[PDB]
Design a protein around this ligand. Structure first.
Ligand SMILES: [Mg+2]
Ligand SMILES: [Mg+2]
Ligand SMILES: [Mg+2]
Ligand SMILES: [Mg+2]
Ligand SMILES: [Mg+2]
Lengths: 133, 58, 161, 350, 183, 49, 182, 137, 40, 48
RNA sequence: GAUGGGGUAGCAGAACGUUGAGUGAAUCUUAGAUUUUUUUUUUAUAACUAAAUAUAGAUGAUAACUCAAGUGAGAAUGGU
């Protein structure tokens, strides 16, 4: 695979050494700034998953700490970090009614919408050691 | 990683871990064929009153 | 606005300028010291053990002082023999030889005079009653403002302020 | 009657037993769900998971109850939580090292862990209730678990006459969490503050037993993983367990002990002076180094808050987020052990 | 959500900013060359900048509903810079709903009764959202005719150097270099 | 009235009112725990069935 | 623990808009205070409110046993030299309760009953309109001073529980964005 | 002197370290006489056996309930319940509803407001005007 | 109400009022308001 | 096999055996209406 | 990795609800049928869970399918 930059190989230990770290994962192209332990509530029902399934996220746009920040041009290389989540199940919203109406017309058309949402749980977010790479 | 799911038209699918690699789907008309722990399997586990972990393991 | 989506756009705030300078055809680690207060878990290099390898030059180096507010000076002007006089005068006439009088006579802090001596109980109870009679003169509007001052000080030391 | 046959076939001499029989555990759907909910290894039969729910208040015999199972489990929890706290925060004062232990393996968190497992309590202990329910008697407070702590001779005078109790002595006499040792029926009543403690005490003994049942059947490493998954995985901000008294005096003593130059408070930034809600940002400097920082509405409050943050930074020093544990050596051959940082102690100031 | 979790005490505090209506402003001036030709910020260009501070829009936590604005002390409002003949040809109007009671006054005639501070309050007042926070925000604009004001102690500082002072930038860069000596 | 009088004894307990010492009910004119001659003697003419 | 008497007065010959003002006048006062205000009121119904308020008190003492601790409570004040209780009603009025059993008008409202009658109004142009003669009732809830001493302590505890005023509050930023702005 | 506060306990994060399915019980009420329970009887004979085998951490209780529509009442760890009436539903429609209770939680439905919910502080502290390079008006 | 002739029920409740207030009789909770089996 | 009634649930929880004693202690009809008889005040008046 | 998605006059299709009727000499109900409320859940003009209040063994209620209409009202200076 493409070798990691020398500048990133010399500053990553300082990034992984600081107390806290955050990441901006990308699910289907949309970003989500999360940290280990956060509960992500996706705005869609992920098909083909059940509560207790482990997902390996591999599209990270930005991984950084307080002072430093690692940025990949399209995305950060997968070999540098390891972010995993667990499906916490599905959640729904209260049924909302939209009334489409025009003035001086009695017909009121109703639209009933009740969407489901997949809830994740970031249970791992660590930076790998690239001393070998 | 996936958990044990029941496919309506294919049967019970055992848990699989892709990191260590196996989608095996067992179907039948008896609980034992599905591959899950039944009441019979829970009674033999209770009668094995002789099993004991190693001394060093404790 | 009319919809929750239109509101989000009107209330938008762009990310920091440092994040906009995204690399091109490569990954890099940029140095972005935030304009925020650091937590207590960022131990300073002066508190790190000598064995801790994490000690390292400033991250900036890898790529006078402000005004004085409180600088006290400890003084020891009371000799061992003078401490006995402070204990005899206080117990002899606590009304005349108050801690303020003894503090100025021996050039000490009012707290120190109380460290080596304590007025008799009959005089201490008289001091508490004095402050208890002054508290009854406060109205509902002042008695509640003085109670908050005592609650804000406790909350401050509990980490809640 | 003839129209309503019994749903659960039971002998006539069943409502008189203290707790359901062992074989009753093999026909309850709650145990089979609770056993699989926790992913317990199949080496733990349903008869054992049923014994971890029978509190000593429901059964008086040394067997059939949860007395001895909870003790062996309490030792593992108290041990794995202690060594992990000293490796993560080796400078924590002894007073806060107890609140942190009680905040993880105390009756309060364990009660939440028991409820997070879907464990429903029984109304009254009896042989008719299904073994899948936590059964205890909150009306009887005579239940107690053997503790390694000893009774203080001055206990009588301690609570009455407000005598002093040193922190250094709590390590030998007091309990594991620093507390002092030994500190017909009519149901026409309401809940009491004592029954609330008895119910909370029953839940704690259950979670501890499950760690004991895993220890006897699955071994040591299996119990450590269980404690490391449910108890250690919880979150706690130790910075909020601090309550300082005269912090400026303690910070001056800290620098004096480590030979650092006297701390000096400097006004980094200020605004709104002579207002209702000003902001004074002061920083305590030990010569040229900046120890702590604080921003309050009063000049004194800003200096005090700066001292606390300078102390918290000293006590909250952590070698790493996931530090090695001395128990990692008694397992299968691993890398050699490296000496851990041992703090000299907390600062005792005026 | 973690971004917001923390101590927001200092993010909502009221900062006391300061600006002089006579000091040349390379950013708010239309003349940018030569150095000696740079003018101060015009009335409307200064009010547009102040209105942004009174709204707290310069903060990354701005919300139109929360009154997270700041204070602004403007001095030397007597030497308010204006272009053309605005000072003598601009007119301010008034009406109390009684026909015939149309009050008119020019800028210079309005600067003789209430000084240049009143001309700047009308400019900032029109640039603020017309709602229930308009009077609270406009009250945080303390404009004075000369260099004197009662807030010389309130102005935000950084190491004893008031912002806008000759050597205020050096005092800021010295405090950040000391904050980097920590994990 | 007995539906409302029984719920008060259960709740009030030691403060249950002395209804026997109360006034008459103007809706019918009867004292507490007392019938009316028309109902105690059953003098009300009934149908033939 | 607390005694209470709900008394519904008889059918008074007046309207709701007329009697509503005589019920708000006795609200919160003691039975003795209200009886003195109805005796010197120029309203014709003030005489009917005084008689009904005396009957309500006669039932409060016999049926409910209210206001039967004056002799015992009076002793603790003069015999032991005790300090009376100082409370503050919901409206802010300061009281000095020396007898916790003193009966007072806790709640009061007025309802409208049946129609007294109908009078015909013969106007011009041969028009006729019915004039309804009203008939309203009043319901007073009497309680002892033990209820006010409790409702006051609850108000005080609710204020000391709202914490003190902090200069720099930690107000939340209620807007999430998947990036850092600082 | 530093005194410890004894009123703060740890909080649990389900999913970090160990995952516990919230649904702990599922009641399946049918009727032998009601016509609306014809499909529920088919779900209990063909789809419940295997669906109950794949979810060993859920207690299933099949009991009759004549003169009443069929319902799927699930009990969760938080203490709340969710009952779904499946009258006039085919067996495969019962399974799609049973999976809704299995995946769901006791929490009430809420409108989508914010994706991420966090309890730990910001890695980069909240913005402060006194910890930056200053601002010149 | 002020003109209604006082009946024997109101003449009896006024004599009891003078007995309780004076202190002759001591008030006690009712025992015939309802016939319950609990008796508490 | 049959409908689970509020009595069955109490038996599983263990409360039922306690309810029998109290209801029996107060002479109350455990699982029944008793032997008191129906309301016969309006019936004696000829109510249809 | 199917295609399609505004709508008046107007045309067409598919359903719910209300009243009564058949299966019905059926089913269920003090181990609570029924209770104009409140609450809870489900793609929801509807039904459902629970709670509170009262107490019915049938002149009570009732699924499912079908039959027949005095079957659905913010609008007529509408009527009571
Ligand atoms: Mg005429
Ligand atoms: Mg379209
Ligand atoms: Mg009801
Ligand atoms: Mg008809
Ligand atoms: Mg109409």
């Amino acid at each position: 695979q493409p070798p990691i930059s020398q500048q990133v190989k010399e500053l990553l230990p300082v990034l992984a050494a600081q107390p806290g770290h955050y990441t901006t994962i990308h699910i289907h192209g949309k970003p989500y700034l999360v940290t280990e332990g956060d509960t992500v509530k996706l705005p869609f029902k992920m098909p083909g998953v059940a509560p207790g399934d482990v997902l390996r996220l591999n599209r990270a746009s930005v991984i950084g700490s307080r002072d430093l920040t690692l940025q990949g041009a399209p995305y950060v290389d997968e070999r540098l970090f390891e972010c995993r989540a667990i499906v916490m199940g599905t959640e729904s919203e209260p049924m909302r009614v939209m009334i489409k109406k025009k003035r001086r017309c009695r017909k009121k058309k109703h639209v009933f919408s009740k969407h489901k949402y997949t809830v994740l749980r970031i249970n791992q977010l660590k930076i790998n050691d690239v001393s070998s790479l | 990683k996936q958990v044990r799911r029941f496919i309506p038209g294919v049967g019970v699918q055992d848990e699989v871990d892709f990191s260590k690699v196996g989608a095996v789907v067992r179907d039948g008309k008896r609980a034992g064929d599905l591959g899950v722990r039944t009441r019979s399997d829970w009674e033999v586990i209770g009668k094995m009153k002789s099993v004991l972990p190693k001394v060093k393991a404790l | 606005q009319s919809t929750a989506n239109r509101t989000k756009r009107m209330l938008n705030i762009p990310p920091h300028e440092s994040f906009l300078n995204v690399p091109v055809e490569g990954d890099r680690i940029i140095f972005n010291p935030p304009s925020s207060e650091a937590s207590v878990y960022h131990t300073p290099f002066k508190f790190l053990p000598r064995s801790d390898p994490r000690r390292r030059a400033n991250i900036y180096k890898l790529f006078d002082l402000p005004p004085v507010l409180y600088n006290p000076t400890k003084s020891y002007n009371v000799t061992p023999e003078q401490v006995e006089e402070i204990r005899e005068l206080r117990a002899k006439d606590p009304k005349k030889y108050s801690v303020t009088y003894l503090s100025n006579k021996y050039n000490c802090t009012k707290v120190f005079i109380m460290m080596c001596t304590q007025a008799p109980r009959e005089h201490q109870e008289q001091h508490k009653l004095a402050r208890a009679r002054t508290a009854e003169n406060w109205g509902p509007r002042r008695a509640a403002a003085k109670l908050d001052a005592r609650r804000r000080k406790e909350m401050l030391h509990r980490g809640e302020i | 009657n003839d129209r309503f046959p019994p749903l659960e076939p039971l002998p006539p001499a069943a409502e008189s037993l203290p707790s359901p029989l062992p074989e009753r555990a093999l026909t309850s759907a709650k145990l089979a769900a609770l056993h699989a909910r926790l992913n317990l290894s199949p080496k733990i039969p349903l008869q054992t998971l049923a014994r971890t729910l029978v509190d000593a208040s429901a059964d008086e015999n040394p067997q059939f109850n949860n007395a001895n199972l909870a003790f062996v489990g309490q030792t593992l929890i108290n041990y794995h939580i202690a060594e992990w706290l000293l490796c993560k925060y080796p400078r924590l004062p002894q007073g806060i090292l107890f609140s942190a232990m009680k905040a993880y393996a105390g009756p309060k968190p364990l009660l939440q862990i028991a409820r997070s497992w879907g464990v429903d309590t029984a109304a009254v202990p009896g042989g008719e209730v299904d073994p899948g329910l936590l059964q205890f008697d909150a009306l009887k407070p005579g239940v107690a678990i053997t503790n390694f702590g000893y009774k203080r001779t001055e206990l009588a005078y301690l609570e009455k006459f407000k005598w002093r109790r040193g922190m250094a002595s709590r390590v030998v006499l007091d309990d594991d969490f620093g507390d002092v040792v030994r500190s017909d029926v009519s149901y026409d009543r309401y809940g009491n503050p004592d029954t609330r403690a008895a119910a909370e005490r029953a839940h704690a003994y259950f979670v501890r037993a499950v760690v004991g049942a895993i220890y006897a059947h699955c071994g040591r490493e299996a119990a450590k993983a269980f404690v490391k998954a449910h108890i250690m995985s919880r979150t706690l901000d130790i910075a909020k367990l601090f309550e300082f008294k005269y912090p400026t005096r303690e910070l001056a003593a800290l620098c004096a002990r480590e030979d650092f130059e006297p701390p000096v408070a400097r006004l980094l930034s200020e605004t709104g002076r002579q207002s209702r809600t000003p902001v004074f940002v002061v920083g305590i400097y030990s010569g040229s180094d900046k120890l702590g920082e604080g921003a309050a509405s009063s000049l004194d409050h800003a200096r005090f808050k700066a001292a606390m943050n300078a102390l918290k930074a000293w006590y909250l020093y952590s070698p790493g987020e996931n530090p090695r544990v001395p128990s990692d050596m008694l397992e299968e051959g691993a890398k050699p052990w490296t000496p851990a940082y041992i703090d000299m102690g907390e600062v005792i100031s005026r | 959500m973690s971004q917001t979790v923390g101590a927001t005490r200092l993010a909502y505090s009221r900062v006391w900013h300061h600006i002089s209506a006579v000091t040349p402003h390379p950013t708010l001036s239309t003349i940018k060359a030569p150095s000696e030709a740079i003018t101060p910020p015009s009335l409307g260009r200064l009010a547009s900048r102040i209105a942004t501070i009174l709204m707290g829009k310069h903060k990354p936590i701005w919300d139109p509903s929360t009154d997270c604005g700041d204070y602004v002390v403007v001095t030397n409002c007597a030497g308010l810079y204006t272009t053309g003949h605005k000072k003598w040809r601009k007119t301010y109007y008034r009406h109390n709903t009684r026909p015939g009671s149309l009050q008119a006054i020019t800028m210079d005639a309005l600067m003789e009764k209430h000084g240049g501070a009143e001309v700047l309050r009308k400019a900032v007042s029109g640039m603020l959202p017309k709602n229930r926070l308009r009077d609270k925000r406009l009250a945080r604009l303390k404009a004075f005719e000369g260099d004197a004001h009662p807030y010389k102690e309130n102005l935000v500082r950084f190491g004893g150097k008031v912002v806008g002072a000759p050597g205020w930038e050096e005092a800021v860069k010295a405090i950040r270099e000391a904050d980097m000596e920590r994990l | 009235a007995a539906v409302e009088a029984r719920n008060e004894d259960w709740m009030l307990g030691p403060l249950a009112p002395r209804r026997e010492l109360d006034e008459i009910t103007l809706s019918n004119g009867n004292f507490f725990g007392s019938l009316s001659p028309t109902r105690a003697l059953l003098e009300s003419e009934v149908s033939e069935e | 623990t607390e005694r209470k008497l709900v008394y519904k007065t008889g059918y008074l010959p007046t309207s709701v808009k007329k009697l509503v003002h005589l019920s708000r006048q006795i609200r919160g006062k003691t039975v003795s205070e209200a009886l003195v205000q109805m005796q010197f009121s120029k309203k014709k119904m003030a005489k009917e409110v005084k008689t009904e308020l005396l009957r309500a008190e006669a039932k409060a003492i016999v049926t409910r046993g209210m206001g039967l601790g004056k002799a015992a409570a009076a002793a603790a004040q003069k015999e032991t030299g005790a300090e009376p209780v100082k409370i503050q009603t919901k409206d802010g009025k300061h009281l000095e309760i020396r007898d916790p059993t003193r009966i007072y008008v806790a709640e009061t409202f007025v309802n409208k009953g049946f129609t007294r009658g109908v009078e015909l109004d013969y106007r011009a142009r041969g028009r006729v309109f019915k004039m309804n003669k009203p008939t309203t009732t009043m319901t007073v809830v009497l309680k002892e001073e033990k209820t006010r001493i409790r409702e006051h302590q609850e108000r005080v505890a609710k204020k000391l529980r709202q914490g003190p005023w902090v200069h720099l509050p930690d107000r939340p930023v209620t807007s999430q964005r998947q990036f850092y702005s600082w | 002197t530093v005194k410890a506060l004894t009123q703060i306990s740890s909080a649990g994060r389900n999913g970090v370290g160990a995952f516990v399915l919230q649904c702990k019980k599922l009641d399946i009420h049918y009727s032998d006489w009601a016509g609306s329970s014809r499909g529920m009887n088919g779900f209990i004979k063909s789809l419940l056996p295997k669906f109950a085998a794949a979810n060993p951490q859920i207690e299933f209780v099949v009991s009759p309930r004549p003169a009443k529509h069929p319902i799927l009442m699930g009990h969760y760890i938080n203490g709340r319940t969710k009952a779904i009436c499946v009258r006039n539903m085919e067996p495969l429609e019962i399974l799609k509803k049973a999976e809704l209770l299995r995946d769901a939680s006791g929490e009430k439905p809420q409108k989508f407001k914010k994706p991420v919910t966090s309890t730990n502080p910001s890695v980069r502290g909240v913005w402060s005007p006194y910890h930056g390079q200053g601002m010149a008006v | 109400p002020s003109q209604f002739e006082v009946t024997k029920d109101r003449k009896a409740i006024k004599a009891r009022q003078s007995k309780f207030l004076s202190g002759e009789e001591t008030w006690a909770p009712g025992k015939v308001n309802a016939f319950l089996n609990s008796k508490i | 096999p049959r409908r689970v009634t509020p009595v069955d649930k109490e038996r599983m929880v263990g409360r039922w055996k306690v309810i029998q004693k109290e209801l029996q202690k107060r002479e109350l009809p455990v699982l029944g209406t008793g032997n008191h008889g129906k309301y016969v005040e309006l019936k004696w008046l000829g109510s249809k």
